Ligand binder design. Structure first.
Ligand SMILES: *C(#N)C1=NC([C][C][C])=[C]C(C2=[C]C(C(F)(F)F)=[C]C(C(=O)N([C][C]N([C])[C])[C]C3=[C][C]=[C][C]=[C]3)=[C]2)=N1
Length: 215
């Protein structure tokens, strides 16, 4: 695998979104992974619909949280996911709507990364594209991140409470990192992104619940 990967440089990553008043991080993480695969398959970069997932993935709890694997499974069973334009984001759970011409991507299943294995996560990011990951984002140091390679020894790898998207990896001034796209707007972190410590004993649980969709 390469030493450094950044899918933003290849045009595989859409603009940073803002989930607003809804605990729908999982839907943003899921659509980000789908968007990367759609770009890889077709050449098209476009916004897929987190709202379609919030409203329709009945195994998840809409604005009260969810898993990305449940989302991928839904998109597969549903035979598609709508574009953002067809099924726009409203930031509250509503009834599941059917748009006859709304479909913009499909999913053929998913794979999970071996639990806790950062080398395996790296290899998947290199081979596949952006990968959905879960982390402990509960610390003030994370919430108020602005710069650098984030590491806090108080982060709890077993407290997975936020879903984000690994869009690459690399090294900054000798500190290995994951490049992480959040869904709290461009005004959060570094233009909506955070660099998280890599190969520091699975810091914040970054490799504990990682998955990517098949397309
Ligand atoms: C985002 N946004 C976000 N916000 C909250 C708090 C506001 C609702 C919680 C979560 C969340 C993330 C994750 C993840 F992605 F990190 F893994 C997991 C959960 C969660 O606790 N789940 C249940 C855990 N167990 C039953 C052991 C996942 C879940 C939640 C609801 C329905 C299905 C699955 C929460 N993200």
């Amino acid at each position: 695998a390469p030493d450094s990967v950044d899918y933003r440089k290849k045009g595989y990553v859409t603009p940073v979104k803002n989930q607003g008043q809804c605990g729908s991080c999982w839907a943003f993480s899921s659509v980000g992974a789908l968007e990367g695969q759609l770009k890889k398959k077709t050449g098209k970069l476009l916004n897929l619909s987190p709202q379609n997932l919030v409203d329709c993935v009945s195994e998840n709890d809409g604005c009260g949280g969810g898993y990305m694997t449940n989302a991928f499974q839904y998109v597969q069973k549903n035979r598609g996911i709508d574009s953002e334009d067809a099924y726009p984001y409203v930031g509250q759970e509503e009834s599941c709507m059917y748009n006859p011409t709304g479909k913009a991507a499909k999913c053929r299943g998913y794979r999970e990364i071996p639990e806790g294995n950062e080398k395996a996560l790296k290899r998947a990011v290199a081979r596949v594209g952006p990968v959905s990951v879960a982390i402990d984002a509960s610390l003030t140091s994370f919430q108020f991140y602005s710069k650098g390679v984030y590491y806090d020894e108080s982060c709890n790898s077993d407290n997975l409470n936020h879903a984000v998207l690994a869009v690459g990896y690399g090294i900054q001034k000798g500190n290995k990192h994951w490049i992480i796209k959040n869904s709290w707007g461009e005004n959060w972190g570094n233009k909506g992104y955070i660099l998280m410590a890599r190969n520091k004993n699975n810091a914040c649980g970054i490799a504990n619940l990682a998955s990517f969709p098949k397309m």
